[PDB]
Design a protein around this nucleic acid. Sequence first.
RNA 1: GUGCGCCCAGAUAGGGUGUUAAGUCAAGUAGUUUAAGGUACUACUCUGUAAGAUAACACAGAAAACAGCCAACCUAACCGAAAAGCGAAAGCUGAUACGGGAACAGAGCACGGUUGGAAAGCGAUGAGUUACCUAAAGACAAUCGGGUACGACUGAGUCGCAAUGUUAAUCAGAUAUAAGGUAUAAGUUGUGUUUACUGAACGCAAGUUUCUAAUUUCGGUUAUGUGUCGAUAGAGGAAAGUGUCUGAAACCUCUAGUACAAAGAAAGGUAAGUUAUGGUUGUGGACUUAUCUGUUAUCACCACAUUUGUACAAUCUGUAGGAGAACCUAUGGGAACGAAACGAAAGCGAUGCCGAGAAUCUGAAUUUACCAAGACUUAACACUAACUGGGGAUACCCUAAACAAGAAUGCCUAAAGGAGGAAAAAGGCUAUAGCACUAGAGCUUGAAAAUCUUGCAAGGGUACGGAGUACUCGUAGUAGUCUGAGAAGGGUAACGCCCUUUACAUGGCAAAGGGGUACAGUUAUUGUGUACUAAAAUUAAAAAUUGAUUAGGGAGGAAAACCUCAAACCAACAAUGGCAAUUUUAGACAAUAACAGAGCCGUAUACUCCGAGAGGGGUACGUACGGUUCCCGAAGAGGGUGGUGCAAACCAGUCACAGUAAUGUGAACAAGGCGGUACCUCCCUACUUCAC
RNA 2: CACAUCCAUAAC
Length: 447
Amino acid sequence: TMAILERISKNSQENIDEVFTRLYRYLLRPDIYYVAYQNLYSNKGASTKGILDDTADGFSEEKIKKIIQSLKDGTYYPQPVRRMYIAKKNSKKMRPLGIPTFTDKLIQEAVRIILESIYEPVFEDVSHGFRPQRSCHTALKTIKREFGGARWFVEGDIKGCFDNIDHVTLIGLINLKIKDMKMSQLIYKFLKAGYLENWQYHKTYSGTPQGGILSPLLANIYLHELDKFVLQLKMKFDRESPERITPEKYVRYADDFIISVKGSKEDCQWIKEQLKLFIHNKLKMELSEEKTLITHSSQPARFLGYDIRVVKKRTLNGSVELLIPLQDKIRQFIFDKKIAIQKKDSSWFPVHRKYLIRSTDLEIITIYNSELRGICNYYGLASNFNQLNYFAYLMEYSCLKTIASKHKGTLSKTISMFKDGSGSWGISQAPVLYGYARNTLENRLKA
RNA sequence: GUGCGCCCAGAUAGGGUGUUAAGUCAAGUAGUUUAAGGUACUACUCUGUAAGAUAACACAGAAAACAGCCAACCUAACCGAAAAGCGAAAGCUGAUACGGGAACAGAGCACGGUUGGAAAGCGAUGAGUUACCUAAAGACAAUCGGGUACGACUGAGUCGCAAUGUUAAUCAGAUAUAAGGUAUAAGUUGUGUUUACUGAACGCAAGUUUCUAAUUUCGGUUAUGUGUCGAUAGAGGAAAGUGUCUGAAACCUCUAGUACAAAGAAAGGUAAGUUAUGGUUGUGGACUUAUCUGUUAUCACCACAUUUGUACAAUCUGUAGGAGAACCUAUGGGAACGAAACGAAAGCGAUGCCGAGAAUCUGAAUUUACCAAGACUUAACACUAACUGGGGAUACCCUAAACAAGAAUGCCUAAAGGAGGAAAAAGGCUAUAGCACUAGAGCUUGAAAAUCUUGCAAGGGUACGGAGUACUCGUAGUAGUCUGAGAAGGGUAACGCCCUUUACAUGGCAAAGGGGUACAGUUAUUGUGUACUAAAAUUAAAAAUUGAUUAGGGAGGAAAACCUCAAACCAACAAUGGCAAUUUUAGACAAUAACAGAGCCGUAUACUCCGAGAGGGGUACGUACGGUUCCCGAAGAGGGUGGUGCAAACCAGUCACAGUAAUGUGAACAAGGCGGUACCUCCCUACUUCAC
RNA sequence: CACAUCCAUAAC
C-alpha cells in the first residue's frame, strides 16, 4: 500500500522544524493521515477511484501491485513519454493528461496523496485560482470584483510553467514540505520520468505520460509555493499605489497574471523589475515584451478570457472597476464554430452550421444547446447582454437553419420556424434553448 | 440507387424550334388616309392626373389574340385491390367500380376540358379564447374615469400587392473595343493573402471589401422598439383629472428631444440602384435617384426629418507616445493609427467578347410624308430531344412437366400358405390437435400421387445513375466513305478544335446495359519491411566504470515537540559503449476482398429561366465524345450454403411394456430424428427509404 | 442603464 508514503510524509524527521506548517498543523496534521488510511488507502482492490467516472475494471489489489509495491513492482517504471496539451474550449489553461497506462490508477492515488498533503492547510484553489476555497472558477470572479481601485493591469504571455519545468529545483521544492532532513526519499524515482521523445534524451515533459491527474497540481505547486517568495516584496509594495490614485490580493492563475494594485507607472516599474528578477532567478524562465503590454488605463484586450475596464459597446466603469465580456473569443470561435459570417456587412449573421449533410435532429439541437450552455459558466459575471444577444440570435437562427437544411423543403427555415422549437408548441421538442440562455446570463452575472 | 433516360434510325404516335408561301384575326367612334395598309395627324367620346383637393385646355392611352396565372368542378392517367385470368403465380394483366384525379419537377413530350376572375404567398386584420395599465406614487375601484391595434391566443372575414407580360413604324451616318461588363476553370493546400502547386491554363501585380460619423441633449443605450438616470426643461403633483388618504415641494408628460438660415418639405405611383441575396439562379416588402401636362380660380399651410454653413457644447472623439480617474500634446470628433474577416486574390493589364436609347452634334424626312410581322390556322423545309419506334448478353426467383433421378411393405398359420389368411403402419388420406415430428387416423393400401433433388426447354423480375488503365460476350448488319473518320493530315490549343488531301467495302461502329481478365489507385484484416549502403538528434545513453560521488535503509503502526513494532542499502549530475525504426549517408513489402459521383473546362446539340447582349443559374457532371482533380456511399429487411445453445413435446421396442408388425406406453432437448426462441453472425440482395 | 427582435416566397 502507500503505507510507505504514510511513514514518509507523516513522520518527516520531526525532531526539529518540519513539513510546511509550524504552529497550525500539529493537531491538524494527522487530519490527512487518518483518512488517507481510509480514503487514499481506500481499499486493496480496484477501489480508490479511476477513469470510468469512478474507476476502471474491478481487479483484486488494485490489480496486484500496491500491497507489495513497497517492494517497488514497477521499480523504475519507465513509462514512455511524449507531449500533449489540448486547447480548452475556452479560456484555456490547457490541461495535461497522460499516455494510457493503467499505472494511471497508480498515479491517481499517488497524487490524491499530494493533493491532501499540501492543499489541506496550504495549497489554494486546485486548477487556477489564487485564494483558498473549494471551487474552480470563483476567485476569478469575486477577487476580481473585490478590490482593484486602480489602472494599469499587466498581462502575461510566456508560459514558464510547462515549457519551462525545473526538474531539479522541481524536486528541490517538492521535498520542502513532504520529505525531511533525515530518512525520507522513497517517492520520485518515477516522478522524474517525463522522458519526452522529440529526437533527444530529455527528462522534461510537455504532458508527462507518467499521469494526467497530477500534472495540473504539479504545475500548481511549481507556481504556488514560490508565489509566496515573489509576494514577499508585494508585502511592502502597496505603500502608496493604493493611496496615490485614491483621493477624490494578488492575481494568481495557472498561467496569466496582472499586478494587484496600481498607483503609478513609477509604482509599476517595481513590478517591471522585480517580477522579472525572481522569475528569472527561481523559475528558470523569463517573461516577454518587457514585463508586458502595460495598459495605460484600459483596452478591449484579453485577460484569462475576461477584460477589465480600468454594437459590442456596453462597458462601464467609474470610481469603481468591473468586468466585461470582451470581443476576441467571440470573434474567434464565433467564426471558427461557423456561427457568423462577416463577409456580408451588417456585421454578422446566423447563416447556418458548416455541415451540408448533418447528424440527427435531437443531436443537432442538443449539441447546439451544450455549445450555448458553454456560456453558462465562462460568460458568467458579465455586462454586455446585447452583444451576447447578437451572439444568441446568430446561434438560434443557426440551429433553426440547421434543422431546416436537414428537412430541406422550401427554404425550410420558415417551416422550421413554424414546426418545432419554441413557438410551434409541440419528441421534436426542447423548450430550454434561449430563455434559459438569458437565465444563465442574468444569474451567475448578477448573482 | 432520382417518374422516364440504355445505344442507333425520323421527327404528329403525340410534338418542339427555325425560317420561308401566306392567310385570318381586333386597334374608342368617325375623318383624308394605305387598302382590309394602322397609333402619323384632323375631329370626336371615354380614359389618367392626388407628382401634393377644385374646374379649362395641352399630353399619355382606348382594343384584339397569345402567353401566363388563379380558383372551381368534371374524367383519362396513376392506385392496395378488384375482375378475368397464364406450370398458379414467381409474378404478371385496371374499357369502367371506391380512392386520387393538374401526380411530384415537366425544365426534352402533355390529363384534358368547362365555368368564372381569381388562389396560395406577403404586408395592412374581421371575428372569436388576453395581458397592461393609466397623467397625480399608488391604493380604492371591468367603475370603458378611460381603453385595446402595444398584444395575445387561435383560428379567418376587409384591403394591398402579387392579380399581368407580350405585337412595327420616317432613314442614315458620326467620339464604334469610350468610359462598362462580362469572362481565365473548378479543385487541393500553404492560413501571414507571403505568389505554390493539379496533366491549371492563360498573362502583371499583395492587403482588395467592408468599416472606427454626424456640433450647443440625436446625452447614460445596439441590429428593433421600449422604458428609466442625469445635466434644460413643471401648474399640478394630498382638497384626486371617476372616488379616497397619506406620503416630497419633489413627481409625473412636456418642454429648454440647436441658433437660425437657406429648398424641399406627406400619400402613393413609374422605372431603375440596391437591399431582399446569404447555399446556386428569377417573382413579395425596405431604402436611394428621379419621374408623375403649364397656367387662372378657394385651395395653397403649423409642423415635419434631413444637406449646408458653422456657432459651441458635452460626452471625454481612433491615432503616436505620455497621460493622479475632473489627464494632455498633436493630426482633433480618418486627422491610414489602425480594425477585421479577408490564400495564383481582389486590383491591374492584355487578348478575345459585348454596344438600345440610333450619346449629342450634321445631310434629317415630302401626297402627316413610311408600315407590311403580333396570334391562329395552312404549304414547305433545315434542325431536335431522355419521345415513338428497334435491339437486349450478365447474374437471379419460381412451376409442373416421375423430361432423369436417389424414395416404394409388415409379420404371423408355417420357405409351404402367404399377408389375395389378418391387421395396419409405409407414400398418402383428410381435417387439425400441434413445438417440428406423430400426422393422428378408418381409409387406397402392401408405391403412387406427393421427404429431399438439381436441371432440357423454358416463366418472371431487378441492373440501362459518368469513377484508373485491355479482353469473352448480343452486333463487327441495325448505317458505308463519323462529327471520336477511315487515312496523310497540317496547324492549333490540356488534349478533343480548326480547316485541307482523301481510300468504297468485314473501312466506321468494331453500338448499348454486365461480367471477369491484367496491372493501378484508394479504405479494411494478418503478415513482412525492417541496409539495394554504415554511421547520426541519439532515442538504448537514470546502465556499468560511475567521479574520489550526495543528505537519505525492512516492512508497519502512532500528533509535532516522535513514541512504540522485528532483532551494510538503492536511487543524486551525467559522459560514455553497441543497435532498434525511420530523421539524419543511402543499389515496409507482401497476401485477401470490396468498390461510388463533387465538379469544372472545351466541341456538338435539348430545355428553361435572368440579362440590351456577350454571358450567368438550372435540367443525373443536361446528354454523349475529349482533360482533368477532387474523391473511394449509408442504413434497414428479407433471404439463404452455413451456423449457435435452450422449455416443452416427438415416435415404433431409438427406451421399456406385451401383443400376429403396426399395435398401447407413459421415459425423453437418455431429443434417435426433428423443429419454436436464441446468439453473434456469414454472404448475397439498389430489398426499401436516403445521400447527387 | 435597459428590454428585447424584424424578416419573405420560391428554381437544385
